[PDB]
Enzyme design. Sequence first.
Site, PDB file in Angstrom:
ATOM      1  N   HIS B  77      -8.499   0.042 -11.778  1.00 17.24           N
ATOM      2  CA  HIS B  77      -7.563  -0.158 -12.877  1.00 17.24           C
ATOM      3  C   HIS B  77      -7.979  -1.161 -13.902  1.00 17.24           C
ATOM      4  O   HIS B  77      -7.606  -0.982 -15.102  1.00 17.24           O
ATOM      5  CB  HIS B  77      -6.116  -0.496 -12.324  1.00 17.24           C
ATOM      6  CG  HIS B  77      -5.431   0.681 -11.709  1.00 17.24           C
ATOM      7  ND1 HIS B  77      -4.038   0.800 -11.603  1.00 17.24           N
ATOM      8  CD2 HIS B  77      -5.934   1.866 -11.317  1.00 17.24           C
ATOM      9  CE1 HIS B  77      -3.746   1.976 -11.055  1.00 17.24           C
ATOM     10  NE2 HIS B  77      -4.849   2.667 -10.934  1.00 17.24           N
ATOM     11  N   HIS B 244     -10.713   7.866  -3.270  1.00 15.32           N
ATOM     12  CA  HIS B 244      -9.669   8.349  -2.316  1.00 15.32           C
ATOM     13  C   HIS B 244     -10.248   8.584  -0.947  1.00 15.32           C
ATOM     14  O   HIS B 244      -9.537   9.079  -0.065  1.00 15.32           O
ATOM     15  CB  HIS B 244      -8.841   9.488  -2.893  1.00 15.32           C
ATOM     16  CG  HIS B 244      -7.995   9.078  -4.068  1.00 15.32           C
ATOM     17  ND1 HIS B 244      -7.223   9.934  -4.796  1.00 15.32           N
ATOM     18  CD2 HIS B 244      -7.782   7.845  -4.623  1.00 15.32           C
ATOM     19  CE1 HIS B 244      -6.656   9.277  -5.811  1.00 15.32           C
ATOM     20  NE2 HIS B 244      -6.923   7.971  -5.699  1.00 15.32           N
TER      21      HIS B 244
END
Lengths: 713, 713
Positions: B77, B244
């Site tokens: 992020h 992920h």
Amino acid sequence: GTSNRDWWPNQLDLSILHRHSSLSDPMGKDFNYAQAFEKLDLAAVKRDLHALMTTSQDWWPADFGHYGGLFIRMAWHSAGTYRTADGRGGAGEGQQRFAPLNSWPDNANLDKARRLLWPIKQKYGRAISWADLLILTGNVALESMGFKTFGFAGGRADTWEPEDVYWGSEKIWLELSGGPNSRYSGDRQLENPLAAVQMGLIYVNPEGPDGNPDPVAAARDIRDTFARMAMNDEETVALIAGGHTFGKTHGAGPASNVGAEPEAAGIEAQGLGWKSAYRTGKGADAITSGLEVTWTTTPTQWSHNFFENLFGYEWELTKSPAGAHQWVAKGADAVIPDAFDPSKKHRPTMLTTDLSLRFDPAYEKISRRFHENPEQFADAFARAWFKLTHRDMGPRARYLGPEVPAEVLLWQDPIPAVDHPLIDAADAAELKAKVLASGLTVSQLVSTAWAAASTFRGSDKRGGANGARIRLAPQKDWEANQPEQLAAVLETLEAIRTAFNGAQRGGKQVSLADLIVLAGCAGVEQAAKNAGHAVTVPFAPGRADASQEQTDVESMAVLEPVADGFRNYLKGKYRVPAEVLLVDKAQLLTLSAPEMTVLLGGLRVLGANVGQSRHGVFTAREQALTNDFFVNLLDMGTEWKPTAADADVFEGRDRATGELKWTGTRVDLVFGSHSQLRALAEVYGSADAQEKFVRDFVAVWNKVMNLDRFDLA
Amino acid sequence: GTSNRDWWPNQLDLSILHRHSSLSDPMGKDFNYAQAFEKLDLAAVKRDLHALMTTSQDWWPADFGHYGGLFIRMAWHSAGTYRTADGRGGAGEGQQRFAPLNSWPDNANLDKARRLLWPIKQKYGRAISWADLLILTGNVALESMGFKTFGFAGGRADTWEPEDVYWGSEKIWLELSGGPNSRYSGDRQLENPLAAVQMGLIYVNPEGPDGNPDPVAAARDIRDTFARMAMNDEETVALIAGGHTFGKTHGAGPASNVGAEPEAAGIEAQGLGWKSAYRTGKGADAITSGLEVTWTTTPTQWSHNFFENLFGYEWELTKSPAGAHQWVAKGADAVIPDAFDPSKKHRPTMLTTDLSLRFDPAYEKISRRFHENPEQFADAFARAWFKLTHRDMGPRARYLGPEVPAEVLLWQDPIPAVDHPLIDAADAAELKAKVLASGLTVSQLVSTAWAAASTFRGSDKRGGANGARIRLAPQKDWEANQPEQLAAVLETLEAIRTAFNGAQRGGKQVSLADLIVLAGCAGVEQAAKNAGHAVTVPFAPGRADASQEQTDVESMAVLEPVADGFRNYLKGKYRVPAEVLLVDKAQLLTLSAPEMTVLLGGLRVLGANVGQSRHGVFTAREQALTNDFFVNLLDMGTEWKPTAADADVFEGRDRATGELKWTGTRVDLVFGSHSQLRALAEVYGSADAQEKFVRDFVAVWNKVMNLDRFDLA
Ligand code: NA
Ligand code: NA
């Protein structure tokens, strides 16, 4: 684009502390305005201004062939934004050329007046500031029309961006009182720090309060607003009647003919606004306020015809061509000249606010004295005009040029001249040792010097440690200053002073103002020693002691700190959060966010809090200059919660045991909450920051001590 | 308190040009972060980071006993806000710790992550910036979990206030498309410069486009937004699947239990937010996104289990405990571990946007290749993670420390090393004289060097004159660069170069990149001579020429100027007014408002306009360096009006006769309209300012010529 202010409209604004960067200023970093001005040929500038007065431009033709009334209004408005409560506004930064003031409805068509002055500003360039020029031009207008001014000082340096001022919370220009953001409450009490009755007005509404044409009620609003601009009844009457000796108002057609203010206007308007569709849009057809009054039979010459007319006629309520309320003389002949057609004459007219000078009983007595004694009127107006236009200039040391009045005026908070040799570095070292040997503590010494120096505000350059007014009424009795504790410290310092001064030869002596500062410097050096660090705190002598008789006690009231986050002090319970009041104080001290953060974290651990409060004293070595405030505030091992007794006081407990470790206020804890202030606290709370913290604290302490030292500029 | 932005919400904001002043920065003006970093014990920092991974704090307990997944998301992020359109966003200024990014819904609970890092930041202090720490921590998390990274560079200096970025115009967090301020129009066309689908998201919505759980439609948004972050299909698949492989989502109960984001929270929260009323509010009970997905059987170890699961099951649509859409594996056994309770196991789950990697046909082919060749997946993810986290760092000369990859990557716009003696001052004088003897004009020389240097943007430190990319595709074909004119100048310069280089001994040669800039400096010197001024323009050699094969033509497209006010150029008709686009460009060039003013006024009279447009050429002595632009723009003898043909072009006529004197654009005329820009123009249009104008122009010209010269820093 959506901004942080949109998402978090109540979060604190630190940008107010970071204006005036060298980035935004087009002049070099070494530019010194006073050096430029002092070589300006001021007499040549005044000869150019005098010529301009009667050289009409066709894009804004001169009333009566003379721009003097327009320019007097221009200069009055430049000065008329001033509020005594915070010192903000006034003519000293030339802010009338920037938003919002350039577009206030009360400044309509002063855009034209300022444009008329571009050729002269262009000719003289950097040697005369816009700020000085606007005042100078009002003085030349007065002189050209037969009025002897009291004098003029230069030295207002130009600024390059809008000042951050709270002008009120209304969202509609000129909104009448009693709306959702009313600036009035109670029995017509105007909220501090405001000094105007409606958003976008200078002082009062010329039609009367919220438009009601009652001279007696208008007088109330005049008295209140002028008092909030530091003027008393005599000065008020002198100014209003003096101003309205000249020129005229403009209301030749309906106000719906007037277009966008300058900040809203199209790019092609090139910085002008209020373009009017009514007839020629200018000159005989001008619309400014909407009123249509011409006060005297000689609008381009000083006279005592304003009071002759006010008292020589009875007055009838009437409407201008734009629909505004105003007054006309009953049964009068057409004796007032027209501004463009030599074959037309008009009856005498007045504003509601002019008639206040006759129908308010206290104003009536002054007005009658001025009517019967016009020489008294002329002298009061000259003095009041000087005060008005200089009120925010600061100490007389800042006054420049050949026309500075030699009379020293009480309102200037005067400081006597120094007439003896000053102490040198070895004397300063001897005095710091004597102070520390007296038994005065680090807390006492720091708190006293902070109380003396922190009254400074950069908005009007009042306050500071020069003068030693901390020993005088009213400062010596302010609650924030801890009056019994202060008295004890000052007694000890005055004995040290007497003993040093008695031992000297050659006339060398130390003032108490300098010794208070030097003693605080000794306290900071000792606190650094207590932490294991040897530092020397800079000190510059040359302050002088003012007398009680040279101090206006009433005028000093506005400088009382009722909120001083640097001492964890709040005098009462206020609407505005304490953290916002800290940033307001920091801006008046001229501090940046880094400077505010170092200073507060140091003061906490030195013992500067009023009342010896433990709030924010996050150390087990009080009176030692360390970074413990920041290391302890940022420790995630402590959890904080507001107390049940007081939501504004917080307890810090160990997160694992619950044991109470600290207490703090909103002012303390904002440094661990606000994302920008917390970033600053992290720099000073790091393991490598002890030296940096000490150095930066000493630097910002010395900055504060020197804020009023324009004798050294 | 009502502000100027409230009154005039569409007026231009110049504060964006005066951010990052030394006022807001706590470090000294001489602090040099690169010097600090280069002495940091990086290995010690990484040992501490490794320890941190498994040191759970009770106020935000670590999933699976290991914070690695949290930290990877944190770093992702930090980098993920980047937009190739303007180069704004990204990890390079540590802006995740400031508003608004610290409070975006997609950054929920990353306040906890950054707070876990405070003890390390404190310990190392100014020698590691927050910006570098956030990326380094992501790298250590990967290494700790068994993934070998491609490398790491330090040198991201910390910043001290929020960056001014257009993130969109919506007034509601996460608003779905088609509202009053929609960022979408047409066939799902996202407005430039944005690179996220909803306000407060990093790239896309994990439930699908506008919340509709269609993996094929989600894929379309993933491709578009990742391309707008400079990633292609292979990099995109590698990054999503690689990320992920680790950790989990948090959605244990309804989102209505989550309170105020950090910027809205109470002071007692001490900079944290999203306090949850659901059960313990943390750990097993955490609520972040609202989704409840754990992707692999080993969430704390690198594995090939992401793709085994994605391809090995068929997926069924279901809801998390907060009500969000997600997918669960049909008929699977409970093989995924629980983060806190060793007696619970869960079925495999996926987001919609994970399923995109299988159901989009182009991603499916990449995903299958990665599943069949996991070594390829590992290398691709390592390279993509480096690119992601370094994309905004600029040239490789800025890369610091012992872990910098030696391999030169195309995306870095590499510049070859210089391996020969550089030209000296006598050589520079000889080359300037040859350039001026060739017959190239001031306009040609200035325009070419301006075109070469003015591609630089400070946001991601791409562009500039180093590399001589102006001679290559696609820069040589951009309309703003006047391709036919440019070709003729380059041909003449390359002939000068060839002749100079052929005459040297000892290996000395001049690059074309240097010669383009030197030739521009000769043009400025000549223009000053044409005005009667003796001026030398500084020049620093050392630029090298990059090849076409070192120049990714698609990546270079975002640097094309579609608005360049400095050349009075607009490629098309846009929604945003041209003066806002000029301030945007100034900000990318790192200019202050005075610098932008001087520069633009000089370029106008030097003939730098595209197509030799007369717009804003307010002089009768073109190709002479004078302040004429300012003197004529501010002359009140001229009246301006928009044309009937085009509202964006203005005609300036003599006020008295009506005769046409000039034409200009909005970019020209804003300098006479905006009250702060006009105050700057006044300084340069004053009678005392000709020398100041010339010196200031030379300085700002030199500045722009050296913006990319990190080889000299
Ligand atoms: Na002021
Ligand atoms: Na960036």
